C-alpha cells in the first residue's frame, strides 16, 4: 500500500523569474487577494468609448498639427517657404521626430546647460519607445484662405538624403539647394493643388527605401558631430513650393496659412527598447526659467 518511487530524477535549474520581459507565459506573481481565480470583468460600461483605444492602428492614427506656414506675396516661386521655422517647407516623411528646441539655463559664470526639448505627435510619441519602424505615412495639407485668394501650390516627394545644415546644436534644412532651376520638380511624384475652390488634400506616402526598417533616432543628438542616424531614418522629404505666386487683392490679407497635419497608418515596429542614447525621459516644464531639470543617467 506504500510502494517505492517509480519516477525518474527530474533535472533542475534554479532560475527565479525565468523570462520576465515577455507578454506571454504564466508568471509566478502571488496575488494578495482572497480568490486565486481573481477575474475582473470585460471592458463593458467602463470607458465611455467602444473603440479599442490602445491598438497602434488607432494610437498612431491620431492627427496632429506639425507646421503652420505663412505664404506671402514677397516669397518667390519654385522655392520652398524659408521662414525661420526652420523646416517649414521641407517636411521629412517618416514617423519619428525631426524638430527640437533648445533650453539654455545658467549654472556658473561660464557654464550652461542646453536641454533638447522635442515636440511629439502621437505617431512620434509611440516611435520613441521602439527602435526600428516601418509605416505608411499620411499628411493632410490645408490652406487657410479667404474666398478671394487663388494660386497653384505644388507638393512633391523626394526619396533619400535630405539636404541639411549641420550647426553646433541643431540641424536645419538647406534652402540654397532646393531653389532654382538647380533642383527641378519634373520627375518626382507630385500634386498640384488649386487655391481657386479646392482647399484640402491628403497625401499618403507609402514606405520605400531599400531596407526593411528605418531607425527611430530622428533628431536626438543630431548635430555637426553625430548625424548618421538622422540620414538613415526618413526616406526623404515632402516639399511644398509654389508653382504660381499668390494673387491677392488689397482688401484681403497677403498672408495665408498652410497647416500640415500628420499621422501614420499600417504601423509596425521591431524592438521594445529605445535606440537613443538616453532613457525615455518625459519633459516636465519648470515653473521658473532659473530652475533646471533632473537628468536620468546610465549607471545601474
Amino acid at each position: 500500500s506504500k510502494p517505492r518511487n517509480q519516477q525518474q530524477v527530474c533535472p533542475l535549474q534554479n532560475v527565479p523569474a525565468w523570462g520576465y520581459s515577455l507578454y506571454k507565459g504564466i508568471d509566478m506573481s502571488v496575488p494578495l487577494a482572497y480568490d486565486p481565480n481573481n477575474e475582473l470583468g470585460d471592458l463593458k460600461d467602463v470607458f465611455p468609448s467602444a473603440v479599442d483605444e490602445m491598438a497602434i492602428g488607432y494610437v498612431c492614427g491620431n492627427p496632429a498639427v506639425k507646421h503652420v506656414l505663412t505664404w506671402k506675396t514677397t516669397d518667390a516661386i519654385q522655392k520652398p517657404i524659408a521662414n525661420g521655422d526652420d523646416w517649414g517647407g521641407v517636411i521629412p516623411v517618416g514617423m519619428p521626430c525631426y524638430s527640437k528646441s533648445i533650453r539654455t539655463t545658467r549654472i556658473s559664470a561660464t557654464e550652461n546647460r542646453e536641454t533638447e526639448v522635442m515636440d511629439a505627435a502621437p505617431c512620434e510619441y509611440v516611435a520613441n519607445m521602439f527602435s526600428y519602424w516601418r509605416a505608411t505615412m499620411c499628411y493632410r495639407i490645408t490652406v487657410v484662405k479667404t474666398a478671394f485668394h487663388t494660386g497653384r501650390l505644388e507638393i512633391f516627394f523626394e526619396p533619400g538624403v535630405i539636404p541639411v545644415k549641420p550647426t553646433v546644436n541643431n540641424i536645419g534644412p538647406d534652402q540654397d539647394r532646393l531653389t532654382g532651376a538647380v533642383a527641378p520638380s519634373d520627375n518626382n511624384y507630385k500634386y498640384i493643388l488649386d487655391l481657386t475652390n479646392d482647399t484640402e488634400v491628403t497625401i499618403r506616402v507609402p514606405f520605400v527605401s531599400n531596407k526593411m526598417f528605418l531607425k527611430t533616432a530622428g533628431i536626438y543628438g543630431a548635430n555637426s558631430e553625430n548625424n548618421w542616424n538622422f540620414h538613415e531614418s526618413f526616406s526623404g522629404f515632402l516639399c511644398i513650393r509654389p508653382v504660381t505666386k499668390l494673387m491677392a487683392p488689397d482688401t484681403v490679407s497677403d498672408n495665408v496659412s498652410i497647416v500640415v497635419w500628420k499621422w501614420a497608418e499600417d504601423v509596425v515596429v521591431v524592438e521594445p527598447k529605445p535606440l537613443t542614447s538616453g532613457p525615455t525621459q518625459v519633459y516636465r516644464p519648470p515653473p521658473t526659467a532659473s530652475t533646471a531639470v533632473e537628468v536620468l543617467n546610465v549607471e545601474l
Partner: protein, 208 residues
C-alpha cells in the same frame, strides 16, 4: 468658379506597387518574427523602474514613496503611457530583485501587505493578505496587487479624496538595496485617449 469655398476631400496617394498590409507580414517574417500590434500587450512586461532603492532597516515602506517620484519620468511603459491616457483600471504586478551585501549573522526576510493609496506609514494595520520570501534562498519577490476599488476607474493624480483603491506596503528587516520592476496585471488597461505631451532629449551641457 464662383466666389466661395468647398471642401472636396482628396485622399490622393503616392507609390502604389502592392497592398501595404501584405508586405508588412513579409517584412516582419524575415526581420522580426514578433509582430507587435496592441499597446495593451506592453503593459504585461516587467521593465525596471529603478536601479537602486536603499531601504532603511525595519520600516513598513509604502511604494508610493517611490511611485510619486517614478511616475514623473516615464522610464518604464506604465508611466510613459501615463501621458497618452487619463484613466486606468487593473492591478500592478511588482518584482523585487535583491542586490544587498548580505550578512551571515542575521536571517534576512521580506514581507509585503496592502494599504489603500496615499496613506502614510503608521495609519494602517498589518493583518491582511500577505506574502513572504527569504532572500538567501529566493532573491525575487513575486507580488501582485489586485484591483480593490470603490470606483470602476481611476484618474491620474486625483483630488483630496484618498484610500479609494489598494496598493502595496513593503516591509523588510535589514537595510536591503534592491531593483524594482513592474507592469500591470492580466486585466490592466488604460483608456480615454488624449494627445501626448513633450519629450526630453540629451543634456550634454556645453560651456558657452
Amino acid at each position: 468658379i464662383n466666389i466661395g469655398n468647398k471642401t472636396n476631400e482628396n485622399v490622393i496617394s503616392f507609390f502604389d506597387s502592392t497592398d501595404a498590409e501584405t508586405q508588412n507580414h513579409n517584412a516582419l517574417m524575415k526581420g522580426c518574427g514578433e509582430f507587435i500590434v496592441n499597446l495593451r500587450t506592453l503593459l504585461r512586461t516587467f521593465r525596471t523602474i529603478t536601479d537602486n532603492w536603499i531601504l532603511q532597516a525595519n520600516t513598513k515602506t509604502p511604494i508610493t514613496d517611490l511611485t510619486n517620484t517614478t511616475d514623473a519620468q516615464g522610464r518604464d511603459y506604465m508611466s510613459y503611457l501615463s501621458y497618452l491616457y487619463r484613466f486606468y483600471r487593473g492591478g500592478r504586478r511588482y518584482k523585487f530583485f535583491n542586490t544587498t551585501p548580505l550578512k551571515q549573522s542575521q536571517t534576512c526576510y521580506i514581507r509585503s501587505f496592502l494599504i489603500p493609496r496615499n496613506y502614510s506609514a503608521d495609519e494602517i494595520n498589518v493583518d491582511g493578505p500577505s506574502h513572504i520570501t527569504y532572500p538567501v534562498i529566493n532573491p525575487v519577490h513575486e507580488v501582485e496587487v489586485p484591483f480593490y476599488s470603490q470606483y470602476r476607474k481611476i484618474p491620474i493624480a486625483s483630488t483630496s479624496d484618498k484610500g479609494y483603491d489598494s496598493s502595496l506596503m513593503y516591509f523588510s528587516n535589514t537595510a536591503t538595496t534592491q531593483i524594482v520592476a513592474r507592469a500591470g496585471n492580466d486585466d490592466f488597461t488604460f483608456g480615454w485617449m488624449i494627445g501626448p505631451p513633450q519629450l526630453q532629449g540629451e543634456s550634454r551641457s556645453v560651456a558657452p
